[PDB]
Amino acid sequence: VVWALCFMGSLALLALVCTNRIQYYFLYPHVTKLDEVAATRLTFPAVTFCNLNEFRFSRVTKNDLYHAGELLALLNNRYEIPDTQTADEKQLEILQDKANFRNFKPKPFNMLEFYDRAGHDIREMLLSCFFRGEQCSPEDFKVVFTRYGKCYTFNAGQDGKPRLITMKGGTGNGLEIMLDIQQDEYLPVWGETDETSFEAGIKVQIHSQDEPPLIDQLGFGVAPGFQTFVSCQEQRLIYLPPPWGDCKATTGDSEFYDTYSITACRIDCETRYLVENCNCRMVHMPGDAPYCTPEQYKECADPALDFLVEKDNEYCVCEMPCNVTRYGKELSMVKIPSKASAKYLAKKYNKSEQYIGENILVLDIFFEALNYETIEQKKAYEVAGLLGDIGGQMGLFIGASILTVL
Amino acid sequence: LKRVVWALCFMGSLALLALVCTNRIQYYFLYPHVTKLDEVAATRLTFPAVTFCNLNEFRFSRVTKNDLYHAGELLALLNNRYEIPDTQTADEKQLEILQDKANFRNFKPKPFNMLEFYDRAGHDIREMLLSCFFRGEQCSPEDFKVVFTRYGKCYTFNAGQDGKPRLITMKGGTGNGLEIMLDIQQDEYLPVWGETDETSFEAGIKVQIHSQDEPPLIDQLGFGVAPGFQTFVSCQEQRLIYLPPPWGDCKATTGDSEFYDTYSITACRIDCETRYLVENCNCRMVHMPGDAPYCTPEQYKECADPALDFLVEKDNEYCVCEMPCNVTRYGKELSMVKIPSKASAKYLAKKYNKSEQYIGENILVLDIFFEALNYETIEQKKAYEVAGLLGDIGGQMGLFIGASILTVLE
Amino acid sequence: CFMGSLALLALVCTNRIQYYFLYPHVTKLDEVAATRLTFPAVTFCNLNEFRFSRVTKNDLYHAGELLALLNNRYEIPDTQTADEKQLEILQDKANFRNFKPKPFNMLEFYDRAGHDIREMLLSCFFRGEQCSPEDFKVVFTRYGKCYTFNAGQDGKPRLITMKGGTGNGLEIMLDIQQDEYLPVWGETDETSFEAGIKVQIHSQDEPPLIDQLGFGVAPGFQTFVSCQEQRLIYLPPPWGDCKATTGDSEFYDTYSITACRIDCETRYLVENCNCRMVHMPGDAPYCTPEQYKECADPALDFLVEKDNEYCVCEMPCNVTRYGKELSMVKIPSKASAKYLAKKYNKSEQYIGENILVLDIFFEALNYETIEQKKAYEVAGLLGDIGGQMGLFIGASILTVLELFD
Amino acid sequence: EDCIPKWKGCVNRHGDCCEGLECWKRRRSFEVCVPKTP
Amino acid sequence: DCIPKWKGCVNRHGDCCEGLECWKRRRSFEVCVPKT
Amino acid sequence: DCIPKWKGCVNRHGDCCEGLECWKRRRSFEVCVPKTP
Ligand SMILES: *[C@@H]1O[C@H](CO)[C@@H](O)[C@H](O)[C@H]1NC(C)=O
Ligand SMILES: *[C@@H]1O[C@H](CO)[C@@H](O)[C@H](O)[C@H]1NC(C)=O
Ligand SMILES: *[C@@H]1O[C@H](CO)[C@@H](O)[C@H](O)[C@H]1NC(C)=O
Ligand SMILES: *[C@@H]1O[C@H](CO)[C@@H](O)[C@H](O)[C@H]1NC(C)=O
Ligand SMILES: *[C@@H]1O[C@H](CO)[C@@H](O)[C@H](O)[C@H]1NC(C)=O
Numbered sequence A: 001v002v003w004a005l006c007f008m009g010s011l012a013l014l015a016l017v018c019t020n021r022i023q024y025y026f027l028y029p030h031v032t033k034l035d036e037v038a039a040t041r042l043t044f045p046a047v048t049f050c051n052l053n054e055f056r057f058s059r060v061t062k063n064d065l066y067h068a069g070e071l072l073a074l075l076n077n078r079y080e081i082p083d084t085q086t087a088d089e090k091q092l093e094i095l096q097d098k099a100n101f102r103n104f105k106p107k108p109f110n111m112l113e114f115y116d117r118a119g120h121d122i123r124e125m126l127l128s129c130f131f132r133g134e135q136c137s138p139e140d141f142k143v144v145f146t147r148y149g150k151c152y153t154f155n156a157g158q159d160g161k162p163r164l165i166t167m168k169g170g171t172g173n174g175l176e177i178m179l180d181i182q183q184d185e186y187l188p189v190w191g192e193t194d195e196t197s198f199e200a201g202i203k204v205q206i207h208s209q210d211e212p213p214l215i216d217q218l219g220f221g222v223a224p225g226f227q228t229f230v231s232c233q234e235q236r237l238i239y240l241p242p243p244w245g246d247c248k249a250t251t252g253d254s255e256f257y258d259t260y261s262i263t264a265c266r267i268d269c270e271t272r273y274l275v276e277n278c279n280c281r282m283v284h285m286p287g288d289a290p291y292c293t294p295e296q297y298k299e300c301a302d303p304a305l306d307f308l309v310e311k312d313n314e315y316c317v318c319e320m321p322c323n324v325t326r327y328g329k330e331l332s333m334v335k336i337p338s339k340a341s342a343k344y345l346a347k348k349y350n351k352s353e354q355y356i357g358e359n360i361l362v363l364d365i366f367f368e369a370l371n372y373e374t375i376e377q378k379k380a381y382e383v384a385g386l387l388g389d390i391g392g393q394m395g396l397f398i399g400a401s402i403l404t405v406l
Numbered sequence B: 001l002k003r004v005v006w007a008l009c010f011m012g013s014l015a016l017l018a019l020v021c022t023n024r025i026q027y028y029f030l031y032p033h034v035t036k037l038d039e040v041a042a043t044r045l046t047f048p049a050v051t052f053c054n055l056n057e058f059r060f061s062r063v064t065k066n067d068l069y070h071a072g073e074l075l076a077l078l079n080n081r082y083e084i085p086d087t088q089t090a091d092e093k094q095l096e097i098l099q100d101k102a103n104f105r106n107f108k109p110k111p112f113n114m115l116e117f118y119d120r121a122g123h124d125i126r127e128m129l130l131s132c133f134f135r136g137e138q139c140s141p142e143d144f145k146v147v148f149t150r151y152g153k154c155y156t157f158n159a160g161q162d163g164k165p166r167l168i169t170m171k172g173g174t175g176n177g178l179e180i181m182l183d184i185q186q187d188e189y190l191p192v193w194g195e196t197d198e199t200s201f202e203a204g205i206k207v208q209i210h211s212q213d214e215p216p217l218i219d220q221l222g223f224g225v226a227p228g229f230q231t232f233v234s235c236q237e238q239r240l241i242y243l244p245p246p247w248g249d250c251k252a253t254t255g256d257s258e259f260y261d262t263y264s265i266t267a268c269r270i271d272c273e274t275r276y277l278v279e280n281c282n283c284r285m286v287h288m289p290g291d292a293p294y295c296t297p298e299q300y301k302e303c304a305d306p307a308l309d310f311l312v313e314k315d316n317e318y319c320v321c322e323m324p325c326n327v328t329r330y331g332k333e334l335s336m337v338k339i340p341s342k343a344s345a346k347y348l349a350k351k352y353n354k355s356e357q358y359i360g361e362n363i364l365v366l367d368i369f370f371e372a373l374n375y376e377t378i379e380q381k382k383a384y385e386v387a388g389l390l391g392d393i394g395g396q397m398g399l400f401i402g403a404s405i406l407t408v409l410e
Numbered sequence C: 001c002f003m004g005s006l007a008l009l010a011l012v013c014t015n016r017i018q019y020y021f022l023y024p025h026v027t028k029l030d031e032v033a034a035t036r037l038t039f040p041a042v043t044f045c046n047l048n049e050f051r052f053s054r055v056t057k058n059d060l061y062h063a064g065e066l067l068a069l070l071n072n073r074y075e076i077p078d079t080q081t082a083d084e085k086q087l088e089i090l091q092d093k094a095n096f097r098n099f100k101p102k103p104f105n106m107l108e109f110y111d112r113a114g115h116d117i118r119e120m121l122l123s124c125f126f127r128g129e130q131c132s133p134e135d136f137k138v139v140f141t142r143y144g145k146c147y148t149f150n151a152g153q154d155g156k157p158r159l160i161t162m163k164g165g166t167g168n169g170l171e172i173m174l175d176i177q178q179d180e181y182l183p184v185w186g187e188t189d190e191t192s193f194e195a196g197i198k199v200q201i202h203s204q205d206e207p208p209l210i211d212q213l214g215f216g217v218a219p220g221f222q223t224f225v226s227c228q229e230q231r232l233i234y235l236p237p238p239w240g241d242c243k244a245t246t247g248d249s250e251f252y253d254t255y256s257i258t259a260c261r262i263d264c265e266t267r268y269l270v271e272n273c274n275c276r277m278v279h280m281p282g283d284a285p286y287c288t289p290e291q292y293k294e295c296a297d298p299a300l301d302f303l304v305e306k307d308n309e310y311c312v313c314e315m316p317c318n319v320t321r322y323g324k325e326l327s328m329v330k331i332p333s334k335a336s337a338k339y340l341a342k343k344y345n346k347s348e349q350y351i352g353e354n355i356l357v358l359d360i361f362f363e364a365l366n367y368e369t370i371e372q373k374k375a376y377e378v379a380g381l382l383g384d385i386g387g388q389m390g391l392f393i394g395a396s397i398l399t400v401l402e403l404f405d
Numbered sequence D: 001e002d003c004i005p006k007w008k009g010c011v012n013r014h015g016d017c018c019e020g021l022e023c024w025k026r027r028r029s030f031e032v033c034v035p036k037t038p
Numbered sequence E: 001d002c003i004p005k006w007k008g009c010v011n012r013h014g015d016c017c018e019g020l021e022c023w024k025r026r027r028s029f030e031v032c033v034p035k036t
Numbered sequence F: 001d002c003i004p005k006w007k008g009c010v011n012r013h014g015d016c017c018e019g020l021e022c023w024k025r026r027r028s029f030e031v032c033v034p035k036t037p
């Protein structure tokens, strides 16, 4: 009667395996897999850029000045030109004239229309454009509004245009643009507001098409008077949700954005916050709500937004996405123009040699030979691996039983 | 003999147990490590220490007759004759100032301490710092701790020492990072008439972003920031953990760095450099730790500079630094825009009471912040330790035991 | 009826054999500092192809159109942007009256008129050892005459470094000689709007493609390049896509993507133009200036930018990558300007335009490895699946006796 | 005058903010009254 | 008559021979090249 | 007579004492230092 005593054994041994590794299933371990390669074909990213100057001086009208003057620090509360003005002679003669409101009747004013009309024009700024040896044009850039005003995005992959690809590493297969930033068109800076800049140049952001730009926070600089090489590597990160990980379980709860991204989450919060506090949304914000007026910008929106990003850590909680596309970047610089090319460029664009030196830049954004890296969280222990692992010690005791049945 | 098909059923099953319980144990003794990777955004992230140096060691306006008398030769403003060399490249205006300064007739030398010289004549964070913000909190010169380096008097933001807590950031981007504006004061730069370790062809600053536990070696490991530009430095923090023997090469130390609390490669190097300089020169340089006379200008020139230069560049025998078990690295992406714009020039000129051109030469803005994914870990873990090897053995013999019971019946 | 169950557990093997038949790879990572580390090759080019002072009447006659200094008429175009003095010089140079053309070789032209490392290199140090122009090997690239430091060829051993930081790396000071830059009156592949140099840091086994893969360094700055070496190993089939080096390249010794590309470029140019460019390998007439202009330049431009069919380059099993961090400070300072001006016998302004310092070195952790390894090899499968595998033969051979009963 | 409410300029009077508000200097712009920050 | 491979199509963009299109180049003048 | 450790060997490169070689420095004048294998 020890045939049952050995039956207690195969019952004992089994469950005392079967618990253990089946506890290990519930630790929910993840392993993170890495691979770094060159892709036969690689999807070129979206390239968004902004001029550091918000409004072209030549495009600012009397009505514009009247509404938006204080905001840009060209006027005081008195609708007058402050004595603090740093302006040279000729620009004041122009501005004083522009600023003369005697028998002037104000027309309606829209912040968006202002940005749109007076913002720098890709058609003026873009001297040359190539992608992969195909010539490209201003119509290859989609307009996108940012905190910087009117900005442009190359290969935005929206409005049903397909995303551009590249099969080869190096400058020749990437994007090369030449720009004139038009300092002569820069608004004079007589004071410090969120709408003013000490700097000349552009801001750029390289991002996946599924991720909107936050170009003031996450962008990078490109200076005039240089050719700037940006050598990239695309890195694709995948995360697991709970139980295995932290990443967003329910993705894109907004109708604002087709996909979930941290930037998307932030713009949502920024928008809501500005709507609650100011009753309006800024020009670059999504949604359905009145665009803030210049005064709203100044007395409510600018302050509320500044406060929200820098000071406030309570209001916006953004969970990490399950999918992130990062671009490694290497920047380098050579001078433009050379003494030898200066006159040729001056002649060609009908500008002074010095103007070229201040206003002209060339930007090359391309991929290095190994363009593609993946870092992916995978489940280390799953049930099926579990089935196979604990399958043996049961596959005995069941048949051990199957003999001894009565 | 269908007994034999049961007889080889037990036979080679046992030989299986012996087979695996062998191979697994052989593995265990290989002390294998696996290296685990994770890249994420931290809910809150500890801001690093930011150390910077002006590329100019001594303010021209702060150099006295006594200073010139002792430190003149070192700075190549004087020869062994305590005279101003004819090789002088100076303009007429500084030349006269210097000749006056250099006139020792009926001059009696006072005492001189290299440290005090660096301290007094070094650039002053209070003059250099035009604006400072961290995360939208305004910050002040008192937020910078003085640290001496080969460059002379330098400053460290968020040094996390003297009981001040380390600053944190919960958000990615410029707005949540550090932004400083500096005037490097070229007009205050010492004239360069010759080449010594105390002279520079370059104008600008050197910066090093480092964990608070790691002292700076900013001449070796630093990076440049140029005047006339706004420089964006986008960072990612990367935390590396290593295993010691048997599994790996690393080491941990507390006080096992005599001069420092935590072990770091830089700490190990400064130790060696200090020892070496003390053995060879009998003194330590101004930026070195420990208890020992600070080298005089003369010692700098005839002993310390040569010995230190030699030690770092030429000598590979003397310092051997084992790798730390804990390393914090910062990934960096630099980019640049011009400052100032033609439109902002006069406003800045007026505001700081400087010529438009001066601004263009002397003014820079530095933004150091984190990108959205600020945090990466690369960690060596033990691949095979007791619980796993047991669980394999136990689950292995746990087969054989059971598969025996069958024979133990029929 | 375990004669059911032995057929059942045939599943367990059937799965875990199928996984081996997937030939899984794991990718192993380690990031460290090497006790000693092999310094890479550093190749650089001046952005200007030909020194103005070295261009002769014969040179101008053959290569003038190519450089856009001449039209098809062998005349100086009215579009010329030149100042007075250079125009004077060039008109003289361009006067072919009773001039008889001598023979002309593109390679010799690049070699003679290219910028000279001996003029360009003001100072050089590696690790505190002073270095000289004879430490630079000449390499021809699309940019013309270029130089490579630590090329590790001609039996010279590769340099090493045991320490992190500027002091243990490479520091060079250059004069790019803008005054020697050819005037730009038009746009060809041989002309540049930019002043400065291009640099490529590469393993000695990998030839440079410096126009595609390089980086810039600007005059009037000291540029710090902080590097980390990353060594990538891949598995071939069945496990992976790669191709092992030896014998896989026509004109080159080890396999690299760049090597594969230069092969294709060379073949293509030979097929289309009947000549090879100055920087290409192989044995074939060097293209003439006219061939450059009417055939080679166009065919090469087309091949790299437009054509994705012709060159198919498999990924190498061995890749050495260098992570780079660049930063800049200004040169010279107001205080150092005159001293440099005096020292090199140049105007203060010249220094500001033409002078740069380049520091290439490694950070403390100089070394990272990313290596594909085989996850399941002929122990794991046959140990477990194959081990209990014979047990079903054990079941069948046995259960045949259930039949012979 | 009387207390300065949210988002309004506290320039030149740093104490005049209403309750729950502090006068905050901004990186790019003039100081304003904002919610107090723990 | 028609412009053959690699030759300049400058100022006449339609004059390329068959199988060829007139292609503008980043650094240089436009030329007749194979269609893609 | 012979130039000892760390001292300037400028203008006389052979005058270093034994075990010492005259070494040019990146940022400064040449000095007598220990020989390097
Ligand atoms: C990750 O997201 C990208 C687009 O952002 C998508 O194309 C891809 O399919 C996603 N991968 C996974 C595993 O979800
Ligand atoms: C490494 O060091 C840091 C402090 O220097 C410490 O907070 C951390 O726990 C250590 N990491 C590990 C896992 O060893
Ligand atoms: C402005 O600078 C000049 C010359 O540097 C000086 O004389 C004057 O004191 C300065 N003004 C103020 C307000 O300090
Ligand atoms: C890859 O290349 C290096 C140098 O050629 C060689 O030493 C190494 O063994 C190769 N990697 C492997 C593990 O095959
Ligand atoms: C210095 O430059 C001048 C240019 O006028 C030249 O004449 C002189 O030969 C140069 N000196 C040297 C060192 O050759």
Ligand SMILES: [Cl-]
Binding pocket: A266, A269, A270, A308, A309, A316
């Ligand atoms: Cl935010």
Ligand SMILES: [Cl-]
Binding pocket: B269, B272, B273, B311, B312, B319
């Ligand atoms: Cl050292």
Ligand SMILES: [Cl-]
Binding pocket: C261, C264, C265, C303, C304, C311
């Ligand atoms: Cl190619």
